[PDB]
Design a protein around this ligand. Structure first.
Ligand SMILES: [Mg+2]
Ligand SMILES: [Zn+2]
Ligand SMILES: [Zn+2]
Ligand SMILES: [Zn+2]
Ligand SMILES: [Zn+2]
Lengths: 355, 445, 66, 608
């Protein structure tokens, strides 16, 4: 009787994903993850302790964020002992923040949090940020309270005025002030103050936070942006780099001012212009071109085919596991449905079918 | 060391005898299977063009990161006389063995094979019902014979003589009984293709002129053969040892049509799990495995209780431990079996403990044993407590003078491999009786 | 200036004192005491001494468990 | 054997052990039970269904031989079947449930064994009427056969109090066992004691199971209840007394235990300190109330060598009182010959036995069947360890390498002094000093156990922290105990056979053993139970630490193996440590120099 429970669970899951929309979603991102390292995360209540798992999950979050969206800079400020401590400036290299987080590994989480100080200096760090960049902050929190020097509502008003959004991933339960932050910052939405139920749910939440977010019509900033593809050289001689001032065998060359760099996707240090590859911009095209869900045909009706169109395996036989791409009119197995919907970003049935 | 042993044997085989072995495509195919990936790539590249190459071109092609492995490949290539490297025009002119080259070429093209892949009759039948069943029967008989548990179907007299002569499972004539040597337990620990290759290496070593290259070529094509078909009964020496390996149960022969079982395929190549055992501090056995062969081999070194479907239970006793020890069976052999019979949950727990102890200290101030020492070191402590002495018997030279001379004589013995023990601090050393005369002669000179 | 015919044994002070007790209950087999880790013994009685040593640690433990 | 069972070639050392002749049911996946008919053993899976329902049934009708995490080795015994039918169970139901949940066909010998182990339940009973052991059986059918027995010499007749133990042994021998289920509600001949279960006491589930197994009928079934260390046996006895509401006497084998159980009893039950009169050489007062309690240890009833007249008056008073309930806490010592006068002296109806270990050197533990009765309940030790009712220990057995400095004298020492000579190894002193350093570095309270007072005091003096043994007076030992508990000057102490058992010292999560008995397993088990009742047995990431410094090259390895094998079979393993940690990283080592080693050698040569 487990298949009936699985079917009704899949129905209640798919009721949320019935509506799939091609919203304009931010690509030039600006993501900040502040960390609290206080007495609450010293609890071993989840194995091994909250500090260790948020360290590991932040490592994964950095990797996933830079993989999916390499067109953003990442800054991390830790919270400790009534002080918020900047440990990671916004940068294109994830490895810097990886090393900073590795420093955070060995040190000891202790103290009390101050979202006022944390969000204030996060605002100040987010101040010299260009218009197209979408300023947004992830906040992790384990306390049920917050010691603060002054008002939080002035900070809330300033953050709303400066067009920065937040998303809170609280640990224990809901905190009303964090609900207020999420609602007021997020145009009244309640889809940003999220509480885990276990570590797997925390993993899923982090994966959800990886994704780009849609933007609002009223928050209109539709413009152009200057761009430059550089050229890579492979020289015999080591050559001084502009950024780190040291001898480099290879390195890209600046398309505009003909200097050289060491890493991409990065902006020029000399002509001060952003340099990318077409792979980097095409990386988010699945977000730009979403994929429709695939429908299982019912077991009662007559079937177009009895084996999987894509992976080429036999469909198993009570119910019918034939997920149909209505855009290509072909049914598929669950494994292929998962792979095409998540890993792949094209429908080979729609590739074979001519338009 | 199976490929090492066979390669060593073929290096012992002289150059023109090797070239005779390189004549036929089936032998060349099997030998190509033996060669490491670099040399395999080299010969498949050069086999389709009659352009000899100098060593410099190959060296320029080779990335220097794996240059040691390249050296190993070409050392095997030259020492097998598969290469003809001559310093032509001052450059070590590289040349593959041409008979090997053309026979590989014909094998790859499907050209002239001269039925080296087999004089085919192609009267295919079912093999799971006759060939596999007779093969499993005969192999079960010889396997329980080699275990020592009683079984009526004795092996052939040829293999019986080979066991009598060889140091494998000693048929001690004073006792009249096959007895588990340490080499016998090594054979027991061996993989099935390892056992087959040891058997054929021993049989080839003992067999003399019976043409040795006929046996070699026939063995290589027999490995090259496929299951479940009739074939023509060829050389007569090949035919009579073919009847011999029929009596081993390798082939299902109807006295001219013969039907090779799956054992030829396993001889050619290999194909909470089975064979996975959960260790216990209480020495209880939670095997995820069962066979009467499993019980028969566990009877030698484990006190068991009963047999159930996969669940073979028991308790390892020190009586069982010392029963293994007194046979000459090595505790290293015992832990070879044990560490080849570990279980997923316990090895995951061991790796979790290892990664926990890695961050605390690199040494951890613990003995080096990855398998969990709560159960595993108890045998290993019993292993160290088993031998725990060093015995030197026979001649001994004492009270040296000059340290010079002591080091010279002791170093000389080490070079010739006759030194058994030495102590700088006492200026004394012990040498084997065999090397006594050589050491004395060197001392005088 | 001597070279006597003996069997050198790697040993310990404890298990050398056990060798001395072996000499006490029948003497004259073990030739001389070289150092704490070395001894010289009659080559004809090396495995007689070994089996009696086996009896010695049998009397130490015997691992009966019956 | 449900087969021909032609003997296999691999069944030679299977001397009737090859259990494949059974026709295994296809429901072997669901059913968790095998039967081993060769020795009566039972093989039980810990990963198949019906085991949760069958676990209490197998405890009731069978005894476990070994219970590791994967397979439980049980064994049906006639003792356990008598316990089953005493709880209220029968052979036919046992056979039916066994075939219901058994993967294998039920063996003929096991069927016959359970058929034989069915008692005349209810036929043979005894009551007390005015301190009068009246053998009140339901029929004269019992009277005919019992008078047919030559020992004896609805309807009730007298058997003398010392003759009661002998006739209980005899009736167990002829398999006519007596049940002692007091109708304390129906009997009002005894003075009822107005003691109530306070709402401040609420009972653990396994303790409720223990009560209801001996309170199935509402009467108090008399027997043994074996619970681990710190399980709440005092709470179980308090609950039994409060639901009996009669005059009750409980004796434990220490005046400190007298003193602690008296305060426990006046704490968690509504009996009054007036009703409780404590009997010892401190004071021998009596309560004059119709109902109440008098507590003493077993010594003030056993002894007749040096007794006071007030002691004589008190033991006369307790002889006069016909009690309704008796509990012999720490029941492992009462079947000793000077201690088994309990039936001969005290007139008490219900006889309950609460203890931690149900094992000893001899077979006096089975005499409790005809002294107090069978085991009414036991709690599974590893189940309570995972439940947090008792602790989880990372025991580390230290194989100290023997020094030849002490071995040279140990081999030539005479037998009475070889023991004290190999306890005192300087290498053991070095290892103990670094271990104390390392665990005070970890911040653990450490208690050191030595079997000898001189070794205990020498180790204590080399530490610079005091010692407690059996010859130390009570005032000095409690002063040292409070100094250890509260004073930070006394970080560790040096305990002995007054610390091995019958005390409440659970703070020491770290324990280092430098010496023990020759072969007494119960002393080592109680020493383990000293830290098994530790307070931080419930927090995450906890593992208690047990250490045994044992000299190599001796028989002490076999001695420690013998002493530890019960705990290993329980599930408390003893891991192998020979090369210790921090060896030489410790600067300053006790008797490190060889001159110091020879100094301590000749210092102990002064005694040995
Ligand atoms: Mg004590
Ligand atoms: Zn650079
Ligand atoms: Zn530039
Ligand atoms: Zn598919
Ligand atoms: Zn499609």
């Amino acid at each position: 009787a487990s298949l009936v429970a699985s079917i009704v669970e899949a129905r209640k899951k798919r009721t949320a994903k019935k509506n799939i929309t091609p919203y304009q979603r931010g690509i030039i991102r600006s993501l900040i993850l502040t960390l609290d390292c206080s007495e609450a995360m010293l609890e071993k209540d989840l194995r091994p302790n909250r500090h260790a798992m948020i360290i590991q999950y932040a490592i994964d979050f950095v990797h996933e964020f830079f993989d999916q969206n390499p067109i953003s800079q990442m800054g991390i400020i830790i919270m400790r002992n009534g002080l918020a401590q900047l440990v990671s400036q916004v940068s294109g290299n994830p490895q810097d923040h990886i090393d900073a987080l590795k420093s955070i590994r060995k040190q000891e989480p202790k103290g009390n949090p101050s979202l006022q100080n944390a969000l204030e200096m996060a605002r100040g760090l987010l101040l010299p940020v260009p218009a197209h960049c979408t300023r947004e902050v992830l906040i992790v929190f384990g306390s049920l309270s917050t010691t603060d020097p002054g008002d939080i509502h002035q900070t809330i008003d300033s953050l709303v005025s400066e067009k920065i959004r937040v998303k809170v991933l609280g640990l224990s339960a809901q905190v009303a002030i964090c609900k207020e932050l999420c609602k007021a910052t997020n145009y009244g939405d309640e889809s940003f103050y999220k509480i885990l139920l276990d570590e797997t749910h925390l993993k899923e939440l982090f994966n959800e936070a990886v994704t780009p977010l849609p933007v609002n019509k009223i928050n209109k900033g539709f413009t152009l942006v200057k761009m430059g593809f550089p050229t890579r050289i492979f020289e015999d001689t080591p050559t001084f780099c502009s950024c780190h001032s040291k001898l480099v065998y290879g390195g890209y060359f600046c398309p505009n001012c003909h200097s050289k760099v060491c890493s991409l996707p990065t902006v020029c240090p000399c002509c001060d212009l952003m340099l990318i590859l077409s792979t980097h911009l095409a990386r988010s095209y699945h977000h730009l071109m979403p994929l429709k869900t695939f429908a299982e045909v019912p077991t009662t009706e007559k079937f177009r085919s009895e084996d999987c169109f894509s992976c080429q395996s036999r469909f198993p036989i009570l119910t019918s596991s034939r997920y149909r791409c209505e855009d290509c009119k072909q049914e598929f197995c669950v494994d292929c449905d998962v792979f095409i919907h998540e890993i792949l970003h094209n429908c080979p049935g729609c590739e074979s079918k001519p338009v | 060391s199976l490929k090492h042993s066979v390669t060593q044997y073929l290096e012992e085989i002289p150059q023109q005898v090797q070239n005779r072995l390189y004549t036929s495509p089936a032998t060349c195919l099997a030998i190509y299977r033996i060669l490491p990936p670099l040399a395999k790539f080299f010969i498949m590249a050069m086999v389709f063009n009659e352009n000899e190459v100098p060593l410099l071109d190959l060296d320029k092609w080779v990335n220097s990161n794996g240059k040691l492995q390249f050296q190993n490949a070409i050392k095997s290539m030259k020492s097998l006389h598969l290469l003809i490297p001559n310093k032509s025009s001052g450059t070590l002119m590289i040349n593959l063995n041409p008979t090997f080259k053309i026979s590989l070429r014909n094998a790859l093209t499907g050209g002239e094979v001269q039925n080296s892949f087999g004089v085919v009759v192609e009267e295919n039948v079912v093999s799971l019902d006759l060939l596999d069943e007779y093969s499993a029967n005969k192999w079960e008989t010889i396997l329980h014979f080699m275990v020592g548990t009683p079984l009526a179907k004795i092996p052939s007299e040829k293999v019986l003589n080979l066991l009598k002569h060889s140091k494998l499972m000693e048929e001690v004539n004073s006792t009249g009984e096959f007895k588990i040597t340490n080499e016998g337990f090594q054979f027991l620990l061996q993989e099935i293709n390892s056992q087959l290759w040891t058997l054929l290496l021993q049989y080839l070593k003992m067999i003399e002129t019976m043409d040795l290259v006929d046996v070699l070529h026939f063995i290589f094509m027999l490995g090259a053969l496929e299951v479940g078909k009739a074939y023509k009964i060829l050389s007569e020496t090949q035919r009579i040892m073919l009847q011999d390996m029929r009596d081993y149960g390798l082939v299902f022969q109807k006295h001219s049509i013969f039907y090779p079982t799956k054992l030829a395929l396993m001889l050619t190549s290999d194909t909470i799990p089975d064979g996975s055992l959960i260790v216990e501090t209480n020495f209880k056995i939670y095997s995820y495995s069962n066979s009467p062969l499993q019980i028969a081999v566990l009877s030698l070194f484990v006190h068991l209780k009963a047999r159930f479907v996969n669940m073979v239970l028991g308790q390892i006793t020190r009586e069982s431990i010392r029963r293994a020890l007194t046979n000459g069976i090595t505790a290293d052999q015992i832990i070879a079996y044990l560490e080849t019979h570990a279980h997923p949950q316990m090895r995951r727990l061991a790796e979790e403990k290892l990664e926990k102890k890695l961050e605390l200290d690199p040494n951890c101030k613990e003995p080096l044993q990855v398998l969990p020492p709560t159960v595993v070191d108890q045998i290993r402590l019993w292993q160290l407590e088993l031998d725990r002495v060093i015995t030197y018997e026979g001649s001994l030279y004492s009270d040296f003078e000059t340290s010079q001379e002591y080091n010279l004589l002791s170093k000389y013995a080490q070079d010739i491999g006759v030194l058994l023990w030495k102590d700088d601090k006492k200026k004394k050393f012990f040498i084997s009786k065999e090397g006594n005369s050589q050491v004395l002669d060197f001392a005088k000179r | 200036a001597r070279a006597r015919k003996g069997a050198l044994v790697q040993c310990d002070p404890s298990i050398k004192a056990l060798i001395l007790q072996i000499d006490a209950k029948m003497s004259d087999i073990v030739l001389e005491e070289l150092d704490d880790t070395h001894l010289l013994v009659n080559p004809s009685k090396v495995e007689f001494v070994k089996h009696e040593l086996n009896r010695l640690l049998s009397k130490n433990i015997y691992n009966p468990m019956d | 054997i449900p087969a021909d069972f032609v003997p296999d070639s691999v069944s030679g050392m299977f001397r009737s052990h090859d259990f494949s002749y059974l026709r295994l049911r296809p429901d072997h996946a669901s059913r968790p039970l095998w039967i081993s008919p060769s020795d009566g053993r039972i093989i039980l899976e810990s990963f198949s269904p019906l085991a949760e329902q069958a676990q209490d049934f197998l405890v009731t009708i069978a005894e476990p031989i070994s219970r590791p995490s994967h397979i439980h080795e049980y064994k049906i015994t006639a003792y356990s079947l008598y316990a089953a039918v005493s709880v209220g169970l029968e052979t036919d139901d046992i056979i039916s449930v066994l075939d219901r949940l058994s993967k294998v066909p039920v063996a003929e010998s096991i069927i016959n064994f359970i058929k034989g182990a069915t008692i005349s339940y209810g036929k043979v009973k005894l009551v007390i009427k005015h301190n009068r052991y009246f053998v009140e059986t339901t029929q004269a059918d019992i009277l005919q056969m019992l008078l047919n027995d030559s020992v004896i010499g609805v309807h009730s007749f007298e058997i003398a109090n010392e003759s009661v133990e002998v006739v209980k042994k005899r009736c167990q021998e002829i398999d006519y066992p007596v049940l002692e289920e007091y109708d304390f509600r129906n009997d009002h001949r005894n003075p009822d004691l107005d003691i109530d279960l306070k709402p401040s006491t609420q009972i653990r589930p396994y303790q409720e199971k223990s009560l209801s197994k001996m309170f199935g009928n509402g009467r108090a079934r008399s027997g043994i209840i074996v619970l681990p260390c710190g399980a709440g046996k005092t709470l179980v006895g308090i609950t039994a007394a409060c639901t009996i509401k009669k005059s009750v006497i409980v004796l434990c084998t220490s005046s400190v235990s007298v003193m602690q159980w008296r305060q426990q009893f006046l704490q968690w039950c509504t009996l009054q300190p007036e009703n409780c009169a404590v009997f010892t050489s401190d004071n021998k007062e009596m309560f004059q109330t119709e109902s109440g309690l008098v507590v003493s240890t077993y010594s003030m009833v056993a002894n007749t060598r040096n007794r006071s007249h007030d002691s004589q008056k008190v033991m006369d008073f307790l002889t006069g009182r016909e009690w309704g309930f008796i509990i012999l806490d720490e029941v492992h010592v009462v079947p000793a010959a000077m201690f088994r006068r309990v039936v001969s002296t005290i007139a008490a109806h219900a006889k309950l036995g609460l203890t931690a270990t149900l094992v000893r050197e001899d077979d006096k533990i089975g005499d409790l069947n005809f002294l107090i009765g069978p085991k009414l309940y036991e709690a599974n030790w590893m189940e309570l360890s995972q439940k947090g009712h008792i602790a989880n220990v990372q025991c580390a057995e230290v194989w100290c390498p023997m020094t030849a400095e002490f071995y040279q004298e140990y081999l030539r020492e005479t037998a009475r002094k070889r023991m004290l000579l190999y306890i005192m190894n300087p290498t053991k002193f070095q290892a103990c000093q670094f271990l104390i350093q390392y665990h005070e570095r970890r911040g653990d309270k450490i208690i050191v156990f030595s079997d000898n007072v001189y070794a205990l005091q020498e180790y204590a003096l080399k530490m610079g922290k005091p010692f407690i043994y059996g010859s130390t007076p009570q005032q000095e030992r409690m002063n040292i105990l409070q100094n250890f508990q509260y004073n930070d000057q006394i970080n560790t102490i040096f305990l002995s056979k007054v610390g091995d058992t019958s005390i409440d010292l659970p703070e020491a999560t770290c324990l280092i053993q430098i010496s023990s008995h020759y072969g007494s397993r119960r002393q080592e088990a109680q020493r383990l139970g000293r830290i098994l009742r530790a307070k931080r047995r419930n927090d995450e990431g906890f593992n208690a630490f047990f250490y045994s410094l044992v000299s190599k090259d001796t028989q002490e390895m076999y001695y420690s193996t013998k002493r530890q094998a019960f705990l290993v079979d329980q599930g408390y393993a003893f891991k192998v440590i020979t090369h210790l940690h921090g060896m030489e990283n410790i600067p300053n080592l006790a008797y490190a120099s060889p001159r110091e080693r020879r100094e301590l050698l000749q210092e102990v040569l002064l005694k040995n």
